[PDB]
Amino acid sequence: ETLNGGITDMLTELANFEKNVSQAIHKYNAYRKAASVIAKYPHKIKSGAEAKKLPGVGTKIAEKIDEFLATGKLRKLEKIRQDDTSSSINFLTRVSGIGPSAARKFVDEGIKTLEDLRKNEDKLNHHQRIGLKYFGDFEKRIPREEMLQMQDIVLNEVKKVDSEYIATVCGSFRRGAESSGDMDVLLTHPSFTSESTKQPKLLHQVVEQLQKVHFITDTLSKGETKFMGVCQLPSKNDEKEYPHRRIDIRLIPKDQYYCGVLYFTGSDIFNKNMRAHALEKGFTINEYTIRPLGVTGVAGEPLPVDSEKDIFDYIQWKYREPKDRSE
DNA sequence: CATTAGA
DNA sequence: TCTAATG
Ligand SMILES: [Mn+2]
Ligand SMILES: [Mn+2]
Ligand code: NA
Ligand code: NA
Structure with missing residues:
Protein backbone atom coordinates (compact mmCIF):
# COMPACT_ATOMS: atom_id res chain seq x y z
CA GLU A 1 0.00 0.00 0.00
CA THR A 2 2.97 2.23 0.61
CA LEU A 3 5.87 -0.08 1.01
CA ASN A 4 5.46 -1.81 -2.25
CA GLY A 5 3.48 0.79 -4.16
CA GLY A 6 6.60 2.07 -5.90
CA ILE A 7 7.04 -1.10 -7.74
CA THR A 8 3.42 -1.15 -8.27
CA ASP A 9 3.11 2.05 -9.94
CA MET A 10 5.89 1.71 -12.44
CA LEU A 11 4.39 -1.70 -13.18
CA THR A 12 1.00 -0.33 -14.17
CA GLU A 13 2.73 2.49 -15.93
CA LEU A 14 4.57 -0.32 -17.66
CA ALA A 15 1.48 -2.28 -18.20
CA ASN A 16 -0.68 0.57 -19.41
CA PHE A 17 1.97 1.43 -21.82
CA GLU A 18 2.15 -1.82 -23.71
CA LYS A 19 -1.55 -2.08 -23.53
CA ASN A 20 -2.44 1.30 -25.16
CA VAL A 21 0.48 2.66 -27.11
CA SER A 22 1.70 -0.63 -28.40
CA GLN A 23 -0.76 -3.50 -28.63
CA ALA A 24 1.12 -6.03 -26.44
CA ILE A 25 -1.87 -7.60 -24.67
CA HIS A 26 0.28 -10.33 -23.20
CA LYS A 27 3.19 -8.34 -21.65
CA TYR A 28 0.45 -5.97 -20.60
CA ASN A 29 -1.38 -8.77 -18.82
CA ALA A 30 2.06 -9.80 -17.58
CA TYR A 31 2.88 -6.32 -16.15
CA ARG A 32 -0.46 -6.35 -14.32
CA LYS A 33 -0.49 -9.60 -12.38
CA ALA A 34 3.04 -9.18 -11.03
CA ALA A 35 1.88 -5.77 -10.37
CA SER A 36 -0.94 -7.39 -8.36
CA VAL A 37 1.11 -9.91 -6.48
CA ILE A 38 3.96 -7.62 -5.76
CA ALA A 39 1.27 -5.53 -4.25
CA LYS A 40 0.33 -8.13 -1.51
CA TYR A 41 3.76 -9.07 -0.59
CA PRO A 42 4.16 -8.21 3.06
CA HIS A 43 7.71 -6.86 2.96
CA LYS A 44 9.93 -4.34 1.28
CA ILE A 45 11.07 -5.83 -1.88
CA LYS A 46 14.73 -5.30 -1.49
CA SER A 47 15.79 -6.52 -4.78
CA GLY A 48 14.73 -7.91 -8.03
CA ALA A 49 15.88 -11.37 -6.96
CA GLU A 50 13.68 -11.17 -3.79
CA ALA A 51 10.66 -10.12 -5.96
CA LYS A 52 12.00 -12.69 -8.35
CA LYS A 53 10.79 -15.27 -5.89
CA LEU A 54 7.25 -14.26 -6.85
CA PRO A 55 4.83 -15.91 -9.23
CA GLY A 56 4.65 -14.05 -12.52
CA VAL A 57 7.85 -12.26 -11.55
CA GLY A 58 10.27 -12.91 -14.29
CA THR A 59 13.72 -12.20 -15.30
CA LYS A 60 12.40 -9.22 -17.29
CA ILE A 61 10.45 -7.55 -14.38
CA ALA A 62 13.08 -8.46 -11.76
CA GLU A 63 15.37 -6.52 -14.01
CA LYS A 64 12.92 -3.63 -13.95
CA ILE A 65 12.96 -3.72 -10.26
CA ASP A 66 16.65 -3.34 -9.76
CA GLU A 67 16.95 -0.18 -12.02
CA PHE A 68 14.20 1.21 -10.06
CA LEU A 69 15.54 0.05 -6.86
CA ALA A 70 19.07 1.42 -7.21
CA THR A 71 18.13 4.38 -9.38
CA GLY A 72 14.85 5.94 -8.34
CA LYS A 73 13.95 5.94 -11.99
CA LEU A 74 13.68 3.77 -15.02
CA ARG A 75 14.80 4.95 -18.47
CA LYS A 76 12.10 2.90 -19.99
CA LEU A 77 9.84 4.92 -17.99
CA GLU A 78 11.50 8.23 -18.93
CA LYS A 79 11.85 7.24 -22.62
CA ILE A 80 8.11 6.66 -22.83
CA ARG A 81 6.95 9.53 -20.59
CA GLN A 82 8.86 11.55 -23.18
CA ASP A 83 7.46 9.75 -26.30
CA ASP A 84 5.53 12.32 -28.20
CA THR A 85 3.71 9.71 -30.11
CA SER A 86 3.06 7.72 -27.08
CA SER A 87 1.93 10.69 -25.03
CA SER A 88 -0.09 11.57 -28.06
CA ILE A 89 -2.26 8.50 -27.75
CA ASN A 90 -3.02 8.86 -24.03
CA PHE A 91 -4.14 12.35 -24.53
CA LEU A 92 -6.58 11.68 -27.43
CA THR A 93 -8.22 8.87 -25.58
CA ARG A 94 -9.59 11.39 -23.01
CA VAL A 95 -11.87 12.51 -25.69
CA SER A 96 -14.92 10.64 -25.16
CA GLY A 97 -15.62 8.16 -27.81
CA ILE A 98 -11.94 7.49 -28.22
CA GLY A 99 -10.33 4.21 -27.38
CA PRO A 100 -6.88 2.84 -27.76
CA SER A 101 -7.70 1.81 -31.30
CA ALA A 102 -8.84 5.11 -32.48
CA ALA A 103 -6.08 6.94 -30.74
CA ARG A 104 -3.53 4.92 -32.57
CA LYS A 105 -5.37 5.10 -35.83
CA PHE A 106 -5.98 8.81 -35.49
CA VAL A 107 -2.25 9.38 -34.65
CA ASP A 108 -0.84 7.78 -37.61
CA GLU A 109 -3.06 10.02 -39.67
CA GLY A 110 -1.17 12.88 -37.99
CA ILE A 111 -4.08 13.94 -35.62
CA LYS A 112 -2.45 14.19 -32.17
CA THR A 113 -4.19 17.15 -30.64
CA LEU A 114 -7.59 18.49 -29.92
CA GLU A 115 -7.34 21.04 -32.75
CA ASP A 116 -6.32 18.34 -35.29
CA LEU A 117 -9.39 16.58 -34.15
CA ARG A 118 -11.40 19.64 -34.79
CA LYS A 119 -9.78 20.23 -38.12
CA ASN A 120 -10.84 16.88 -39.10
CA GLU A 121 -14.33 16.65 -37.83
CA ASP A 122 -15.33 14.28 -40.65
CA LYS A 123 -13.01 11.37 -39.60
CA LEU A 124 -14.74 11.55 -36.24
CA ASN A 125 -17.93 9.69 -35.08
CA HIS A 126 -21.04 11.07 -33.50
CA HIS A 127 -20.03 9.89 -30.11
CA GLN A 128 -16.52 11.33 -30.25
CA ARG A 129 -18.03 14.18 -32.21
CA ILE A 130 -19.84 14.90 -28.97
CA GLY A 131 -16.92 14.11 -26.74
CA LEU A 132 -15.04 16.63 -28.76
CA LYS A 133 -17.64 19.22 -28.50
CA TYR A 134 -17.79 19.08 -24.71
CA PHE A 135 -14.36 17.94 -24.05
CA GLY A 136 -13.98 20.60 -21.32
CA ASP A 137 -17.28 20.16 -19.54
CA PHE A 138 -16.83 16.46 -19.62
CA GLU A 139 -13.69 16.42 -17.76
CA LYS A 140 -15.40 18.83 -15.27
CA ARG A 141 -16.60 17.65 -11.93
CA ILE A 142 -20.20 17.90 -10.71
CA PRO A 143 -20.84 19.84 -7.42
CA ARG A 144 -23.53 17.96 -5.53
CA GLU A 145 -25.23 21.32 -5.18
CA GLU A 146 -25.93 20.60 -8.91
CA MET A 147 -26.43 16.83 -8.55
CA LEU A 148 -29.35 17.70 -6.32
CA GLN A 149 -30.82 20.22 -8.88
CA MET A 150 -30.38 17.78 -11.56
CA GLN A 151 -31.84 14.92 -9.51
CA ASP A 152 -34.90 16.97 -8.73
CA ILE A 153 -35.81 17.59 -12.25
CA VAL A 154 -35.20 14.03 -13.18
CA LEU A 155 -37.63 12.84 -10.70
CA ASN A 156 -40.24 15.29 -11.71
CA GLU A 157 -40.25 14.51 -15.33
CA VAL A 158 -39.95 10.90 -14.55
CA LYS A 159 -43.04 11.27 -12.49
CA LYS A 160 -44.91 13.59 -14.89
CA VAL A 161 -45.07 10.99 -17.66
CA ASP A 162 -46.12 7.95 -15.62
CA SER A 163 -46.63 7.89 -11.84
CA GLU A 164 -45.51 4.23 -11.83
CA TYR A 165 -41.89 4.88 -12.40
CA ILE A 166 -39.19 4.49 -9.92
CA ALA A 167 -35.85 6.21 -10.29
CA THR A 168 -32.74 6.25 -8.34
CA VAL A 169 -29.54 8.13 -8.79
CA CYS A 170 -26.96 5.73 -7.42
CA GLY A 171 -23.12 5.83 -6.74
CA SER A 172 -21.01 8.38 -4.83
CA PHE A 173 -23.85 10.80 -5.41
CA ARG A 174 -26.06 8.61 -3.48
CA ARG A 175 -23.14 7.80 -1.28
CA GLY A 176 -23.29 11.43 -0.26
CA ALA A 177 -20.19 12.69 -2.20
CA GLU A 178 -19.46 16.49 -2.45
CA SER A 179 -18.98 16.31 -6.26
CA SER A 180 -19.64 13.62 -8.84
CA GLY A 181 -18.58 13.23 -12.43
CA ASP A 182 -21.74 11.86 -13.95
CA MET A 183 -25.31 11.25 -12.90
CA ASP A 184 -26.39 7.65 -12.91
CA VAL A 185 -30.16 7.26 -13.01
CA LEU A 186 -31.38 3.64 -12.11
CA LEU A 187 -34.80 3.04 -13.28
CA THR A 188 -37.63 0.65 -13.10
CA HIS A 189 -41.18 0.09 -13.60
CA PRO A 190 -43.63 -2.59 -12.50
CA SER A 191 -44.96 -3.33 -15.92
CA PHE A 192 -41.31 -4.54 -16.45
CA THR A 193 -39.74 -7.61 -14.85
CA SER A 194 -37.50 -10.56 -15.82
CA GLU A 195 -39.89 -12.09 -18.33
CA SER A 196 -42.53 -9.45 -19.51
CA THR A 197 -40.94 -9.12 -22.93
CA LYS A 198 -39.65 -5.59 -22.56
CA GLN A 199 -41.34 -2.26 -23.34
CA PRO A 200 -38.79 -0.32 -25.39
CA LYS A 201 -41.08 2.63 -24.92
CA LEU A 202 -40.44 2.50 -21.26
CA LEU A 203 -37.10 4.27 -21.54
CA HIS A 204 -38.08 6.22 -24.66
CA GLN A 205 -40.87 7.97 -22.78
CA VAL A 206 -38.66 9.54 -20.28
CA VAL A 207 -35.84 10.31 -22.70
CA GLU A 208 -38.47 11.79 -24.60
CA GLN A 209 -39.52 14.06 -21.86
CA LEU A 210 -36.23 15.17 -20.69
CA GLN A 211 -35.52 16.35 -24.18
CA LYS A 212 -38.91 17.94 -24.21
CA VAL A 213 -37.92 20.11 -21.41
CA HIS A 214 -34.28 20.64 -22.44
CA PHE A 215 -32.42 18.72 -19.76
CA ILE A 216 -31.35 16.36 -22.46
CA THR A 217 -29.26 17.94 -25.18
CA ASP A 218 -27.53 15.09 -26.79
CA THR A 219 -27.53 11.33 -27.09
CA LEU A 220 -24.29 9.66 -26.73
CA SER A 221 -26.18 6.44 -27.52
CA LYS A 222 -29.83 5.54 -27.02
CA GLY A 223 -30.59 1.93 -26.54
CA GLU A 224 -33.60 -0.08 -25.47
CA THR A 225 -32.60 -0.17 -21.91
CA LYS A 226 -29.58 2.06 -21.78
CA PHE A 227 -29.71 5.61 -22.93
CA MET A 228 -26.50 7.52 -22.90
CA GLY A 229 -26.26 11.25 -23.12
CA VAL A 230 -25.65 14.52 -21.80
CA CYS A 231 -27.64 17.06 -20.03
CA GLN A 232 -27.48 20.74 -18.93
CA LEU A 233 -29.17 22.60 -16.01
CA PRO A 234 -30.94 25.46 -17.45
CA SER A 235 -28.70 28.37 -17.32
CA LYS A 236 -30.32 30.89 -15.09
CA ASN A 237 -31.22 34.52 -15.64
CA ASP A 238 -27.86 34.99 -17.41
CA GLU A 239 -24.21 35.62 -16.75
CA LYS A 240 -24.03 32.00 -15.68
CA GLU A 241 -24.66 29.18 -18.08
CA TYR A 242 -24.25 25.59 -16.99
CA PRO A 243 -21.65 22.97 -17.84
CA HIS A 244 -22.56 19.98 -20.11
CA ARG A 245 -23.10 16.71 -17.97
CA ARG A 246 -22.83 13.04 -18.78
CA ILE A 247 -26.07 11.42 -17.91
CA ASP A 248 -27.04 7.83 -17.84
CA ILE A 249 -30.45 6.40 -17.71
CA ARG A 250 -31.24 2.73 -17.92
CA LEU A 251 -34.19 0.29 -17.74
CA ILE A 252 -34.39 -2.11 -14.91
CA PRO A 253 -36.63 -5.03 -14.32
CA LYS A 254 -38.66 -4.10 -11.26
CA ASP A 255 -37.80 -7.58 -10.18
CA GLN A 256 -34.12 -6.73 -9.76
CA TYR A 257 -34.11 -3.13 -8.72
CA TYR A 258 -32.70 -3.20 -5.25
CA CYS A 259 -29.75 -5.44 -6.03
CA GLY A 260 -28.46 -3.42 -8.98
CA VAL A 261 -29.15 -0.36 -6.90
CA LEU A 262 -27.49 -1.77 -3.99
CA TYR A 263 -24.61 -2.62 -6.28
C1' DC B 1 -19.40 -7.62 -18.71
C1' DA B 2 -22.86 -6.28 -20.87
C1' DT B 3 -24.78 -2.91 -24.10
C1' DT B 4 -24.66 -0.24 -28.12
C1' DA B 5 -22.38 1.90 -32.75
C1' DG B 6 -20.99 1.25 -36.87
C1' DA B 7 -18.61 -0.55 -40.66
C1' DT C 1 -21.33 -10.34 -37.84
C1' DC C 2 -17.42 -8.45 -35.25
C1' DT C 3 -14.99 -5.49 -32.97
C1' DA C 4 -14.57 -0.73 -30.12
C1' DA C 5 -16.03 1.71 -26.53
C1' DT C 6 -18.72 2.84 -22.08
C1' DG C 7 -19.32 1.84 -17.64
MN1 LIG D 1 -16.81 5.36 -30.72
MN1 LIG E 1 -21.59 6.22 -15.37
NA1 NA F 1 8.72 -16.33 -10.26
NA1 NA G 1 -12.03 7.86 -24.35
Whole structure:
Protein backbone atom coordinates (compact mmCIF):
# COMPACT_ATOMS: atom_id res chain seq x y z
CA GLU A 1 0.00 0.00 0.00
CA THR A 2 2.97 2.23 0.61
CA LEU A 3 5.87 -0.08 1.01
CA ASN A 4 5.46 -1.81 -2.25
CA GLY A 5 3.48 0.79 -4.16
CA GLY A 6 6.60 2.07 -5.90
CA ILE A 7 7.04 -1.10 -7.74
CA THR A 8 3.42 -1.15 -8.27
CA ASP A 9 3.11 2.05 -9.94
CA MET A 10 5.89 1.71 -12.44
CA LEU A 11 4.39 -1.70 -13.18
CA THR A 12 1.00 -0.33 -14.17
CA GLU A 13 2.73 2.49 -15.93
CA LEU A 14 4.57 -0.32 -17.66
CA ALA A 15 1.48 -2.28 -18.20
CA ASN A 16 -0.68 0.57 -19.41
CA PHE A 17 1.97 1.43 -21.82
CA GLU A 18 2.15 -1.82 -23.71
CA LYS A 19 -1.55 -2.08 -23.53
CA ASN A 20 -2.44 1.30 -25.16
CA VAL A 21 0.48 2.66 -27.11
CA SER A 22 1.70 -0.63 -28.40
CA GLN A 23 -0.76 -3.50 -28.63
CA ALA A 24 1.12 -6.03 -26.44
CA ILE A 25 -1.87 -7.60 -24.67
CA HIS A 26 0.28 -10.33 -23.20
CA LYS A 27 3.19 -8.34 -21.65
CA TYR A 28 0.45 -5.97 -20.60
CA ASN A 29 -1.38 -8.77 -18.82
CA ALA A 30 2.06 -9.80 -17.58
CA TYR A 31 2.88 -6.32 -16.15
CA ARG A 32 -0.46 -6.35 -14.32
CA LYS A 33 -0.49 -9.60 -12.38
CA ALA A 34 3.04 -9.18 -11.03
CA ALA A 35 1.88 -5.77 -10.37
CA SER A 36 -0.94 -7.39 -8.36
CA VAL A 37 1.11 -9.91 -6.48
CA ILE A 38 3.96 -7.62 -5.76
CA ALA A 39 1.27 -5.53 -4.25
CA LYS A 40 0.33 -8.13 -1.51
CA TYR A 41 3.76 -9.07 -0.59
CA PRO A 42 4.16 -8.21 3.06
CA HIS A 43 7.71 -6.86 2.96
CA LYS A 44 9.93 -4.34 1.28
CA ILE A 45 11.07 -5.83 -1.88
CA LYS A 46 14.73 -5.30 -1.49
CA SER A 47 15.79 -6.52 -4.78
CA GLY A 48 14.73 -7.91 -8.03
CA ALA A 49 15.88 -11.37 -6.96
CA GLU A 50 13.68 -11.17 -3.79
CA ALA A 51 10.66 -10.12 -5.96
CA LYS A 52 12.00 -12.69 -8.35
CA LYS A 53 10.79 -15.27 -5.89
CA LEU A 54 7.25 -14.26 -6.85
CA PRO A 55 4.83 -15.91 -9.23
CA GLY A 56 4.65 -14.05 -12.52
CA VAL A 57 7.85 -12.26 -11.55
CA GLY A 58 10.27 -12.91 -14.29
CA THR A 59 13.72 -12.20 -15.30
CA LYS A 60 12.40 -9.22 -17.29
CA ILE A 61 10.45 -7.55 -14.38
CA ALA A 62 13.08 -8.46 -11.76
CA GLU A 63 15.37 -6.52 -14.01
CA LYS A 64 12.92 -3.63 -13.95
CA ILE A 65 12.96 -3.72 -10.26
CA ASP A 66 16.65 -3.34 -9.76
CA GLU A 67 16.95 -0.18 -12.02
CA PHE A 68 14.20 1.21 -10.06
CA LEU A 69 15.54 0.05 -6.86
CA ALA A 70 19.07 1.42 -7.21
CA THR A 71 18.13 4.38 -9.38
CA GLY A 72 14.85 5.94 -8.34
CA LYS A 73 13.95 5.94 -11.99
CA LEU A 74 13.68 3.77 -15.02
CA ARG A 75 14.80 4.95 -18.47
CA LYS A 76 12.10 2.90 -19.99
CA LEU A 77 9.84 4.92 -17.99
CA GLU A 78 11.50 8.23 -18.93
CA LYS A 79 11.85 7.24 -22.62
CA ILE A 80 8.11 6.66 -22.83
CA ARG A 81 6.95 9.53 -20.59
CA GLN A 82 8.86 11.55 -23.18
CA ASP A 83 7.46 9.75 -26.30
CA ASP A 84 5.53 12.32 -28.20
CA THR A 85 3.71 9.71 -30.11
CA SER A 86 3.06 7.72 -27.08
CA SER A 87 1.93 10.69 -25.03
CA SER A 88 -0.09 11.57 -28.06
CA ILE A 89 -2.26 8.50 -27.75
CA ASN A 90 -3.02 8.86 -24.03
CA PHE A 91 -4.14 12.35 -24.53
CA LEU A 92 -6.58 11.68 -27.43
CA THR A 93 -8.22 8.87 -25.58
CA ARG A 94 -9.59 11.39 -23.01
CA VAL A 95 -11.87 12.51 -25.69
CA SER A 96 -14.92 10.64 -25.16
CA GLY A 97 -15.62 8.16 -27.81
CA ILE A 98 -11.94 7.49 -28.22
CA GLY A 99 -10.33 4.21 -27.38
CA PRO A 100 -6.88 2.84 -27.76
CA SER A 101 -7.70 1.81 -31.30
CA ALA A 102 -8.84 5.11 -32.48
CA ALA A 103 -6.08 6.94 -30.74
CA ARG A 104 -3.53 4.92 -32.57
CA LYS A 105 -5.37 5.10 -35.83
CA PHE A 106 -5.98 8.81 -35.49
CA VAL A 107 -2.25 9.38 -34.65
CA ASP A 108 -0.84 7.78 -37.61
CA GLU A 109 -3.06 10.02 -39.67
CA GLY A 110 -1.17 12.88 -37.99
CA ILE A 111 -4.08 13.94 -35.62
CA LYS A 112 -2.45 14.19 -32.17
CA THR A 113 -4.19 17.15 -30.64
CA LEU A 114 -7.59 18.49 -29.92
CA GLU A 115 -7.34 21.04 -32.75
CA ASP A 116 -6.32 18.34 -35.29
CA LEU A 117 -9.39 16.58 -34.15
CA ARG A 118 -11.40 19.64 -34.79
CA LYS A 119 -9.78 20.23 -38.12
CA ASN A 120 -10.84 16.88 -39.10
CA GLU A 121 -14.33 16.65 -37.83
CA ASP A 122 -15.33 14.28 -40.65
CA LYS A 123 -13.01 11.37 -39.60
CA LEU A 124 -14.74 11.55 -36.24
CA ASN A 125 -17.93 9.69 -35.08
CA HIS A 126 -21.04 11.07 -33.50
CA HIS A 127 -20.03 9.89 -30.11
CA GLN A 128 -16.52 11.33 -30.25
CA ARG A 129 -18.03 14.18 -32.21
CA ILE A 130 -19.84 14.90 -28.97
CA GLY A 131 -16.92 14.11 -26.74
CA LEU A 132 -15.04 16.63 -28.76
CA LYS A 133 -17.64 19.22 -28.50
CA TYR A 134 -17.79 19.08 -24.71
CA PHE A 135 -14.36 17.94 -24.05
CA GLY A 136 -13.98 20.60 -21.32
CA ASP A 137 -17.28 20.16 -19.54
CA PHE A 138 -16.83 16.46 -19.62
CA GLU A 139 -13.69 16.42 -17.76
CA LYS A 140 -15.40 18.83 -15.27
CA ARG A 141 -16.60 17.65 -11.93
CA ILE A 142 -20.20 17.90 -10.71
CA PRO A 143 -20.84 19.84 -7.42
CA ARG A 144 -23.53 17.96 -5.53
CA GLU A 145 -25.23 21.32 -5.18
CA GLU A 146 -25.93 20.60 -8.91
CA MET A 147 -26.43 16.83 -8.55
CA LEU A 148 -29.35 17.70 -6.32
CA GLN A 149 -30.82 20.22 -8.88
CA MET A 150 -30.38 17.78 -11.56
CA GLN A 151 -31.84 14.92 -9.51
CA ASP A 152 -34.90 16.97 -8.73
CA ILE A 153 -35.81 17.59 -12.25
CA VAL A 154 -35.20 14.03 -13.18
CA LEU A 155 -37.63 12.84 -10.70
CA ASN A 156 -40.24 15.29 -11.71
CA GLU A 157 -40.25 14.51 -15.33
CA VAL A 158 -39.95 10.90 -14.55
CA LYS A 159 -43.04 11.27 -12.49
CA LYS A 160 -44.91 13.59 -14.89
CA VAL A 161 -45.07 10.99 -17.66
CA ASP A 162 -46.12 7.95 -15.62
CA SER A 163 -46.63 7.89 -11.84
CA GLU A 164 -45.51 4.23 -11.83
CA TYR A 165 -41.89 4.88 -12.40
CA ILE A 166 -39.19 4.49 -9.92
CA ALA A 167 -35.85 6.21 -10.29
CA THR A 168 -32.74 6.25 -8.34
CA VAL A 169 -29.54 8.13 -8.79
CA CYS A 170 -26.96 5.73 -7.42
CA GLY A 171 -23.12 5.83 -6.74
CA SER A 172 -21.01 8.38 -4.83
CA PHE A 173 -23.85 10.80 -5.41
CA ARG A 174 -26.06 8.61 -3.48
CA ARG A 175 -23.14 7.80 -1.28
CA GLY A 176 -23.29 11.43 -0.26
CA ALA A 177 -20.19 12.69 -2.20
CA GLU A 178 -19.46 16.49 -2.45
CA SER A 179 -18.98 16.31 -6.26
CA SER A 180 -19.64 13.62 -8.84
CA GLY A 181 -18.58 13.23 -12.43
CA ASP A 182 -21.74 11.86 -13.95
CA MET A 183 -25.31 11.25 -12.90
CA ASP A 184 -26.39 7.65 -12.91
CA VAL A 185 -30.16 7.26 -13.01
CA LEU A 186 -31.38 3.64 -12.11
CA LEU A 187 -34.80 3.04 -13.28
CA THR A 188 -37.63 0.65 -13.10
CA HIS A 189 -41.18 0.09 -13.60
CA PRO A 190 -43.63 -2.59 -12.50
CA SER A 191 -44.96 -3.33 -15.92
CA PHE A 192 -41.31 -4.54 -16.45
CA THR A 193 -39.74 -7.61 -14.85
CA SER A 194 -37.50 -10.56 -15.82
CA GLU A 195 -39.89 -12.09 -18.33
CA SER A 196 -42.53 -9.45 -19.51
CA THR A 197 -40.94 -9.12 -22.93
CA LYS A 198 -39.65 -5.59 -22.56
CA GLN A 199 -41.34 -2.26 -23.34
CA PRO A 200 -38.79 -0.32 -25.39
CA LYS A 201 -41.08 2.63 -24.92
CA LEU A 202 -40.44 2.50 -21.26
CA LEU A 203 -37.10 4.27 -21.54
CA HIS A 204 -38.08 6.22 -24.66
CA GLN A 205 -40.87 7.97 -22.78
CA VAL A 206 -38.66 9.54 -20.28
CA VAL A 207 -35.84 10.31 -22.70
CA GLU A 208 -38.47 11.79 -24.60
CA GLN A 209 -39.52 14.06 -21.86
CA LEU A 210 -36.23 15.17 -20.69
CA GLN A 211 -35.52 16.35 -24.18
CA LYS A 212 -38.91 17.94 -24.21
CA VAL A 213 -37.92 20.11 -21.41
CA HIS A 214 -34.28 20.64 -22.44
CA PHE A 215 -32.42 18.72 -19.76
CA ILE A 216 -31.35 16.36 -22.46
CA THR A 217 -29.26 17.94 -25.18
CA ASP A 218 -27.53 15.09 -26.79
CA THR A 219 -27.53 11.33 -27.09
CA LEU A 220 -24.29 9.66 -26.73
CA SER A 221 -26.18 6.44 -27.52
CA LYS A 222 -29.83 5.54 -27.02
CA GLY A 223 -30.59 1.93 -26.54
CA GLU A 224 -33.60 -0.08 -25.47
CA THR A 225 -32.60 -0.17 -21.91
CA LYS A 226 -29.58 2.06 -21.78
CA PHE A 227 -29.71 5.61 -22.93
CA MET A 228 -26.50 7.52 -22.90
CA GLY A 229 -26.26 11.25 -23.12
CA VAL A 230 -25.65 14.52 -21.80
CA CYS A 231 -27.64 17.06 -20.03
CA GLN A 232 -27.48 20.74 -18.93
CA LEU A 233 -29.17 22.60 -16.01
CA PRO A 234 -30.94 25.46 -17.45
CA SER A 235 -28.70 28.37 -17.32
CA LYS A 236 -30.32 30.89 -15.09
CA ASN A 237 -31.22 34.52 -15.64
CA ASP A 238 -27.86 34.99 -17.41
CA GLU A 239 -24.21 35.62 -16.75
CA LYS A 240 -24.03 32.00 -15.68
CA GLU A 241 -24.66 29.18 -18.08
CA TYR A 242 -24.25 25.59 -16.99
CA PRO A 243 -21.65 22.97 -17.84
CA HIS A 244 -22.56 19.98 -20.11
CA ARG A 245 -23.10 16.71 -17.97
CA ARG A 246 -22.83 13.04 -18.78
CA ILE A 247 -26.07 11.42 -17.91
CA ASP A 248 -27.04 7.83 -17.84
CA ILE A 249 -30.45 6.40 -17.71
CA ARG A 250 -31.24 2.73 -17.92
CA LEU A 251 -34.19 0.29 -17.74
CA ILE A 252 -34.39 -2.11 -14.91
CA PRO A 253 -36.63 -5.03 -14.32
CA LYS A 254 -38.66 -4.10 -11.26
CA ASP A 255 -37.80 -7.58 -10.18
CA GLN A 256 -34.12 -6.73 -9.76
CA TYR A 257 -34.11 -3.13 -8.72
CA TYR A 258 -32.70 -3.20 -5.25
CA CYS A 259 -29.75 -5.44 -6.03
CA GLY A 260 -28.46 -3.42 -8.98
CA VAL A 261 -29.15 -0.36 -6.90
CA LEU A 262 -27.49 -1.77 -3.99
CA TYR A 263 -24.61 -2.62 -6.28
CA PHE A 264 -24.36 0.44 -8.58
CA THR A 265 -24.28 2.51 -5.36
CA GLY A 266 -20.81 1.17 -4.37
CA SER A 267 -18.53 1.40 -2.94
CA ASP A 268 -16.55 -1.04 -4.91
CA ILE A 269 -15.17 -1.96 -1.51
CA PHE A 270 -18.58 -1.97 0.31
CA ASN A 271 -20.14 -4.37 -2.06
CA LYS A 272 -17.04 -6.60 -2.36
CA ASN A 273 -17.12 -6.75 1.31
CA MET A 274 -20.86 -7.54 1.68
CA ARG A 275 -21.01 -9.81 -1.28
CA ALA A 276 -18.14 -11.63 0.39
CA HIS A 277 -20.16 -11.86 3.54
CA ALA A 278 -23.41 -13.27 2.08
CA LEU A 279 -21.28 -16.09 0.66
CA GLU A 280 -20.69 -17.12 4.24
CA LYS A 281 -24.30 -16.47 5.22
CA GLY A 282 -25.41 -18.99 2.61
CA PHE A 283 -25.81 -16.75 -0.41
CA THR A 284 -24.79 -15.32 -3.59
CA ILE A 285 -24.90 -11.63 -4.56
CA ASN A 286 -24.68 -10.03 -7.93
CA GLU A 287 -25.88 -7.02 -9.88
CA TYR A 288 -29.36 -8.52 -10.41
CA THR A 289 -30.19 -10.71 -7.53
CA ILE A 290 -29.25 -12.80 -4.54
CA ARG A 291 -29.41 -16.55 -4.51
CA PRO A 292 -28.93 -19.22 -1.90
CA LEU A 293 -26.07 -21.64 -1.99
CA GLY A 294 -26.44 -25.47 -2.12
CA VAL A 295 -23.68 -27.41 -0.46
CA THR A 296 -23.03 -29.26 -3.81
CA GLY A 297 -20.61 -26.45 -4.16
CA VAL A 298 -23.23 -24.47 -5.99
CA ALA A 299 -26.90 -23.72 -6.34
CA GLY A 300 -29.34 -21.10 -7.40
CA GLU A 301 -32.82 -19.68 -6.97
CA PRO A 302 -33.16 -15.85 -6.71
CA LEU A 303 -34.83 -14.83 -3.41
CA PRO A 304 -37.39 -12.09 -3.67
CA VAL A 305 -36.41 -8.50 -2.84
CA ASP A 306 -38.63 -5.44 -2.03
CA SER A 307 -35.89 -2.99 -0.89
CA GLU A 308 -32.11 -2.91 -0.12
CA LYS A 309 -33.27 -4.16 3.24
CA ASP A 310 -34.32 -7.62 2.13
CA ILE A 311 -30.86 -7.99 0.79
CA PHE A 312 -29.72 -6.64 4.21
CA ASP A 313 -32.07 -8.86 6.17
CA TYR A 314 -31.21 -11.75 3.98
CA ILE A 315 -27.56 -11.87 4.86
CA GLN A 316 -28.65 -10.85 8.33
CA TRP A 317 -26.62 -7.66 8.17
CA LYS A 318 -26.89 -4.14 9.69
CA TYR A 319 -28.87 -1.64 7.55
CA ARG A 320 -26.06 0.42 6.08
CA GLU A 321 -27.16 3.84 4.83
CA PRO A 322 -25.92 5.02 1.57
CA LYS A 323 -23.94 7.67 3.44
CA ASP A 324 -21.79 4.97 5.12
CA ARG A 325 -21.37 2.29 2.42
CA SER A 326 -17.91 3.66 2.07
CA GLU A 327 -16.31 0.35 2.64
C1' DC B 1 -19.40 -7.62 -18.71
C1' DA B 2 -22.86 -6.28 -20.87
C1' DT B 3 -24.78 -2.91 -24.10
C1' DT B 4 -24.66 -0.24 -28.12
C1' DA B 5 -22.38 1.90 -32.75
C1' DG B 6 -20.99 1.25 -36.87
C1' DA B 7 -18.61 -0.55 -40.66
C1' DT C 1 -21.33 -10.34 -37.84
C1' DC C 2 -17.42 -8.45 -35.25
C1' DT C 3 -14.99 -5.49 -32.97
C1' DA C 4 -14.57 -0.73 -30.12
C1' DA C 5 -16.03 1.71 -26.53
C1' DT C 6 -18.72 2.84 -22.08
C1' DG C 7 -19.32 1.84 -17.64
MN1 LIG D 1 -16.81 5.36 -30.72
MN1 LIG E 1 -21.59 6.22 -15.37
NA1 NA F 1 8.72 -16.33 -10.26
NA1 NA G 1 -12.03 7.86 -24.35
